[PDB]
Amino acid sequence: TASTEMSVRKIAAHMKSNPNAKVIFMVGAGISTSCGIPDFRSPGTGLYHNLARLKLPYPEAVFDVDFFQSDPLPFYTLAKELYPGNFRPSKFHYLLKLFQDKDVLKRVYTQNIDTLERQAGVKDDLIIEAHGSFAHCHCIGCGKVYPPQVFKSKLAEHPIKDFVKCDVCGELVKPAIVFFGEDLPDSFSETWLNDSEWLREKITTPQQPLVIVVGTSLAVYPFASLPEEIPRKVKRVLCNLETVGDFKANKRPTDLIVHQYSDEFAEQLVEELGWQEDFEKILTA
Amino acid sequence: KGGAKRHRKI
Numbered sequence: 001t002a003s004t005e006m007s008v009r010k011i012a013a014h015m016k017s018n019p020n021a022k023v024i025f026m027v028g029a030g031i032s033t034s035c036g037i038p039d040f041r042s043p044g045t046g047l048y049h050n051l052a053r054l055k056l057p058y059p060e061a062v063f064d065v066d067f068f069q070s071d072p073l074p075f076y077t078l079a080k081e082l083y084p085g086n087f088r089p090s091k092f093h094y095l096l097k098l099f100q101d102k103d104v105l106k107r108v109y110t111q112n113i114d115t116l117e118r119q120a121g122v123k124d125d126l127i128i129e130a131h132g133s134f135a136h137c138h139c140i141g142c143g144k145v146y147p148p149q150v151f152k153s154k155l156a157e158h159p160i161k162d163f164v165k166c167d168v169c170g171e172l173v174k175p176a177i178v179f180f181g182e183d184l185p186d187s188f189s190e191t192w193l194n195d196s197e198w199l200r201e202k203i204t205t206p207q208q209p210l211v212i213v214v215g216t217s218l219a220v221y222p223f224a225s226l227p228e229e230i231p232r233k234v235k236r237v238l239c240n241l242e243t244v245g246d247f248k249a250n251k252r253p254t255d256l257i258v259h260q261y262s263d264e265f266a267e268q269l270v271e272e273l274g275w276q277e278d279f280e281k282i283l284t285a
Numbered sequence: 286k287g288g289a290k291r292h293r294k295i
């Protein structure tokens with residue numbers, strides 16, 4: 001109906017009246033769809049809705065560590081299509097870079113494995129790749145670490161004969177992407193513990209911190225527990241095509257929900273903040 | 286929270 005401009009305007013208004021509190025972002029596949037990477041669960045268009053040809057027990061099994069061990073072919077097949085390299089960051093990714101340049105980015109917790117936040121120039125210290133990435137590989141048995149080249153080389157083979165195996169225990173080796181059944185990197189909870197403490201300090205001191213959740217269905221734990229764990233005194237924002245997770249289950253009075261595409265949201269926010277000059281330096285850098 | 290990566294319970 002009406003433009004989302006008025007809603008995004010309130011976010012800008014919040015930042016302007018609460019300038020001394022950096023912003024935390026929690027993102028998912030939605031912020032990379034415009035880059036050509038499909039999300040996972042949107043009806044019809046989500047990746048999990050287009051895997052019938054693999055004839056898996058069910059879509060999510062392609063990222064399940066137990067299934068992978070039983071038959072690694074399905075994952076190797078899909079990995080060929082989602083391996084990083086030919087994708088470029090979106091306007092939303094550059095919004096993260098803009099916040100970093102203005103030094104108002106506290107952290108970006110991402111569930112994406114495309115590493116586009118890093119490619120957009122966001123510093124390693126401000127990024128938490130909660131679901132891992134293709135940066136390196138590891139044995140699902142003993143945990144031995146391997147360079148990414150071992151796996152990448154195999155992906156380029158056709159047909160594949162033998163899959164990468166650990167020379168220490170003999171189990172299969174795969175990219176350090178967190179599969180269902182595996183624990184997330186220690187950095188995830190360690191950093192959230194730190195940022196959560198920081199959020200309390202800010203509210204227990206005043207200016208209210210802001211957490212913006214974008215492009216995720218909050219269907220996977222433990223990442224989905226983040227919005228729930230945000231202190232009540234901290235303002236939550238959800239920019240997503242659908243109201244999801246804790247924003248739908250336990251709507252809080254101060255919650256601000258905006259149904260908009262991530263890039264358009266970013267453009268509107270930059271406009272309302274009046275940071276076009278610095279944003280321009282980034283898009284052309 | 287922590288624990289193994291999992292699809293939320295329904």
Ligand SMILES: CC(=O)O[C@@H]1[C@H](O)[C@@H](COP(=O)(O)OP(=O)(O)OC[C@H]2O[C@@H](n3cnc4c(N)ncnc43)[C@H](O)[C@@H]2O)O[C@@H]1O
Binds near residue numbers: 041215
């Ligand atoms: C890769 C992997 O290890 O695992 C994936 C991944 O990290 C994970 C979590 O899925 P994730 O939540 O991130 O994916 P989903 O595919 O579950 O959700 C994407 C969400 O983004 C919304 N969306 C899509 N395009 C958008 C856009 N341009 N602007 C705004 N919103 C948009 C969409 O409506 C949905 O709620 O589950 C998978 O199992």
Ligand SMILES: [Zn+2]
Binds near residue numbers: 141168
């Ligand atoms: Zn091993």
